[PDB]
Amino acid sequence: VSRAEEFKSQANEAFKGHKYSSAIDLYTKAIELNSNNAVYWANRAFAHTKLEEYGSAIQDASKAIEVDSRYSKGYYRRGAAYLAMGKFKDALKDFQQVKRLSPNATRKLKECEKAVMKLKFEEAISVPVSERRSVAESIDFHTIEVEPQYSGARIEGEEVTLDFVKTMMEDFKNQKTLHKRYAYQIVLQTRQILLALPSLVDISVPHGKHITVCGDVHGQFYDLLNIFELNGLPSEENPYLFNGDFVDRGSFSVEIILTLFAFKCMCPSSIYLARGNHESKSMNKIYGFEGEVRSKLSEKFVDLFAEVFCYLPLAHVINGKVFVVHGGLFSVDGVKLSDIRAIDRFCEPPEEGLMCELLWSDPQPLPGRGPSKRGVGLSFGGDVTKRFLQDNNLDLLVRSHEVKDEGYEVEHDGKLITVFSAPNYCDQMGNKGAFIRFEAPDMKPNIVTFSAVPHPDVKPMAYANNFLRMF
């Protein structure tokens, strides 16, 4: 009856081969047979963590703790999962246990205590963005002088031009920087454009025209350039929809966000940007974007980006047929397009509600609903998808949010497609990226996959929270 070690050994094989999803299924089999081995639970917990399924990680690690309360790896894996969710206070308790069980661990406890104190200050000065003055009230780019020695791209007048964007993109490619005057100009103009948008944007693709939908890119700027090489620069004749999560994790997030915003300023109809869960303060604070901004720009840009992100639309509908959202659907039925359109989105994502769910949820293979693997939002089956599409007279749901081996996956009887545009995610997943072309009137999804492309020697998470980097 020692078939548990059988699956357990085959599971560890998948983990070595970066096949975390297959590793999980095999650990599950080992657990089905022997549910009284704490390392089996810790193993599956770590595997979920690799897929960013921190909710499942916490549950698995809690079970390892139940099996052996003096097994420090149980607390370690749970604490690490809590850290990844930004929940330092919950994590602290577990690292306090790891310390108690291993007195000779000291580093990580002190780091966690330190992180909790930083968090305490941060929460104390936390104020809803709608109650604060925009930095656009204190900053006018016109008054920002550019030194003669600056050799980067310049915006000569009030208009962002294609020549400028090309020059800027090339400089970024060569790891150069854009002057703060022009960065302000781009972001401040983007703010104006975004605040005039409804929370759900209707995209019209005229007869004979097309649009390309990209999933997460996560600061992988050189892969972004590769997408543009393969599929053309954004333009009125070649529009793009980037479905959230343009920043964090990858270490060229500033280069990506300034590029995407610049295209919007150049021609608003050339590019559509939806909010992802990583376009929020709680994620940017720890996953690299704030650190990258503070380094490559200045502190004032942090609050400005935060505000601009809060103006990002939550969903798009293409020709009344294709519904595009970052995460997924809702824990309740009957939600109409009008409900999403009316969402007061000018805020950080709350811990519950429509806005949270559409940004954070994932689909499940079986019908119904259940607890989220990430520990935030919920999971929804094919029945949830079909009812939503039917109720709103839609044909197809496109979303992102989840890393895929081939850059995409068709689920829920063909009614849901995940698209993910960050190849070799974090320089380790080895996955392909994908994007989807839609040509009117048929609007049939044309899926194209691509592979990762070289980039300068900068590590992922280089600008991210130091404590979180240790994991």
Using CA atoms, how far apart are residues 178 and 459, in angstroms rounded to an integer?
A: 21
Catalytic residue among 48, 278, 412, 455: 278
| Angle separating helix axes 253-266 and 221-231, nearest 10 degrees | 40
Q: Tell me how far apart the terminal alpha carbons of the chain are, to the nearest angstrom.
A: 35
C-beta separation of 285 from 348 below 8 A: no
| Bridge partners, residue 274, by sequence | 243
**Nearest distance from residue 300's CB to Ni ion, in Å?**
27
Using CA atoms, how far apart are residues 345 and 320, in angstroms rounded to an integer?
A: 22
Please give, one letter per residue, the 3-state secondary structure of 92-133. HHHHHHHHHHCCCCHHHHHHHHHHHHHHHHHHHCCCCHHHCC
Q: Report how far apart, in Å, the C-alpha atoms of 94 and of each of 9, 54, 73, 97, 470 are.
A: 28, 15, 10, 5, 16
| Bridge partners, residue 450, by sequence | 433
- Can you say whether residue 189 is alpha, beta or left, with left for phi > 0 and alpha for psi between -120 and 50 degrees? alpha
Residue (239 or 250) nearer to Ni ion, CB: 250
Residue (246 or 388) nearer to Ni ion, CB: 246
Binding site for Ni ion (CB under 5 A): 216, 245, 276-277, 401
326 is in an annotated binding site: yes
Residue (53 or 245) nearer to Ni ion, CB: 245
Tokens for 43? 């193993």
**Nearest distance from residue 275's CB to Ni ion, in Å?**
10
C-beta separation of 289 from 253 below 8 A: yes
**Nearest distance from residue 327's CB to Ni ion, in Å?**
7
**Nearest distance from residue 329's CB to Ni ion, in Å?**
15
**Nearest distance from residue 150's CB to Ni ion, in Å?**
34
Side chain identity, residue 452: A
393 is in an annotated binding site: no
Residue (276 or 328) nearer to Ni ion, CB: 276
Segment (H or E) for 66: helix 54-67
| Bridge partners, residue 425, by sequence | none
**Nearest distance from residue 359's CB to Ni ion, in Å?**
8
Residue (353 or 367) nearer to Ni ion, CB: 353
Q: Is 455 a catalytic residue?
A: no
216 is in an annotated binding site: yes
Work out the angle at residue 350's Cα, subtended by the Cα atoms of residues 345 and 356, and round it to the nearest 5 degrees.
Answer: 75
Task: Tell which residue, 416, 462, 459, has the closest CA to residue 436.
Answer: 416
245 is in an annotated binding site: yes
10 Å CB burial of residue 191 (0-12, 13-18, 19+) is buried
**Nearest distance from residue 31's CB to Ni ion, in Å?**
26
179 is in an annotated binding site: no
Q: What is the DSSP string of 289-308?
A: HHHHHHHHS-HHHHHHHHHH
Using CA atoms, how far apart are residues 103 and 116, in angstroms rounded to an integer?
A: 21
Residue (46 or 420) nearer to Ni ion, CB: 420
Residue (243 or 270) nearer to Ni ion, CB: 243
Peptide bond preceding 441 in cis form (omega within 30 of 0): yes
Residue (296 or 401) nearer to Ni ion, CB: 401
**Nearest distance from residue 277's CB to Ni ion, in Å?**
5
- Can you say whether residue 381 is alpha, beta or left, with left for phi > 0 and alpha for psi between -120 and 50 degrees? beta
Beta strands in 305-432 (DSSP E): 315-318, 322-325, 362-363, 369-371, 378-380, 396-399, 408-411, 416-419
Residue ranges at the known binding site for Mn(2+): 216, 218, 245, 277, 326, 401
Task: Kindly list the catalytic residues.
Answer: 278
Sequence ranges of the binding site: 216, 218, 245, 277, 326, 401
